Amino acid sequence: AEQELLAQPDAAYMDEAQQDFFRDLLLRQRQELQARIEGEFGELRDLERPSDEADLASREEQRQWQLRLLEREKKLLDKIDEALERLARGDYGWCQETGEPIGLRRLLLRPTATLCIEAKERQEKRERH
């Protein structure tokens, strides 16, 4: 895998190559998410289909569930679009609190992540109080 290949470079963290890698990843996820949203939309235009009196009860509260997913989903898209821009500005891959590098492994599992590990530990530790 290119993942294998990538997880072998060194203090070349976020060079033109490494960046080009994640731009690919993100865009793929973007198109995937985009098309999945389009799904949950028509999946909604199926509860807008002519309603009946009896099935009205559950069908409404089912539409209620959809709208929250469709909402989570729609936001996730922006999260990606934001990271895709971070890449353009050349601010990608770096921890926002401390300019420190965000793990390459880390970024692989969540390309969308904005903090490095220890920053997250410290932010979760504040949350505890």
Side-chain angles (χ1 to χ4, degrees), residues 1-7 9-19 21-44 46-48 50-54 57-129:
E2 180 100 337
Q3 259 156 126
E4 263 189 39
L5 217 151
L6 179 266
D10 356 315
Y13 185 71
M14 286 313 143
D15 66 13
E16 205 148 328
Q18 291 209 194
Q19 291 186 311
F21 177 82
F22 289 101
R23 185 152 42 244
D24 279 346
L25 178 44
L26 277 173
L27 275 151
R28 249 182 273 93
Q29 300 182 170
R30 199 275 190 100
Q31 273 154 324
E32 279 167 11
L33 220 187
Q34 212 151 47
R36 190 160 66 255
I37 291 159
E38 198 200 8
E40 330 295 295
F41 252 107
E43 204 175 43
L44 183 82
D46 282 310
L47 314 113
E48 259 78 308
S51 184
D52 62 310
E53 292 210 4
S58 259
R59 187 136 56 95
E60 206 291 326
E61 78 163 76
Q62 179 58 42
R63 190 198 84 205
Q64 274 287 67
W65 193 80
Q66 288 272 358
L67 286 176
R68 305 290 143 266
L69 168 69
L70 198 54
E71 262 308 323
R72 170 181 164 254
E73 223 71 13
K74 193 140 55 69
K75 205 84 276 167
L76 252 158
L77 185 84
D78 298 346
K79 194 96 275 153
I80 283 181
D81 290 351
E82 285 173 359
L84 274 166
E85 191 66 359
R86 205 127 23 86
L87 277 164
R89 142 64 46 250
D91 258 314
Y92 187 89
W94 282 287
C95 187
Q96 266 182 51
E97 288 185 10
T98 51
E100 286 294 302
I102 301 163
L104 205 50
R105 302 182 164 263
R106 181 169 163 91
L107 277 158
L108 277 163
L109 328 114
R110 267 219 305 150
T112 233
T114 43
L115 288 188
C116 53
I117 319 82
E118 20 283 345
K120 148 258 203 284
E121 258 99 62
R122 277 183 264 111
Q123 196 206 238
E124 290 177 7
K125 214 248 197 149
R126 174 180 48 179
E127 283 186 45
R128 286 187 63 251
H129 302 271

